Ligand SMILES: *[C@@H]1O[C@H](CO)[C@@H](O[C@@H]2O[C@H](CO)[C@@H](O)[C@H](O)[C@H]2NC(C)=O)[C@H](O)[C@H]1NC(C)=O
């Protein structure tokens with residue numbers, strides 16, 4: 685009812701928080717991935 | 733007949749051309765057709781090994797049927813093209829990346 689705990693000292697604490705802000709920007713070549721060097725495959729993929 | 737590429741004893745009547753390296757060419761090695769730059773390769777092939785594959789099961793090294801020389805196959809240079817424009821209202825000049 686009448687007890688209080690009072691700090692008589694202190695600690696200066698340095699902690700780390702690590703936050704991702706960006707990820708790798710990636711580009712994909714449609715034809716070169718689906719039809720690497722097949723011109724016929726590229727022509728077929730044109731329809732899709 | 734077994735079609736998976738290997739040292740091919742039996743081949744069709746095709747007249748071989750000269751082997752040209754360090755240039756982007758269409759190539760046909762024992763029925764294996766592709767487009768790329770053929771270059772000298774340091775890969776050491778065992779006698780039964782006639783070509784090499786990468787992690788995508790794409791032929792990245794081949795052995796010449798005549799000279800038994802290992803050749804690395806690199807895709808012909810490619811990339812994206814980006815057009816930097818000030819705006820057609822401002823100007824018709826562009827830059828290409
Ligand atoms: C508050 O805490 C600090 C430590 O964080 C105390 O300083 C230490 O005191 C002891 C004994 O006097 C020394 O051996 C240490 O080297 C001191 N450390 C530093 C960083 O100075 C300080 O005495 C405490 N104060 C009170 C009033 O308790």
Ligand SMILES: *[C@@H]1O[C@H](CO)[C@@H](O)[C@H](O)[C@H]1NC(C)=O
Pocket residue numbers: 685
């Ligand atoms: C004081 O604390 C005791 C035990 O924690 C409790 O029984 C009592 O009721 C408290 N005082 C008052 C006035 O309530």
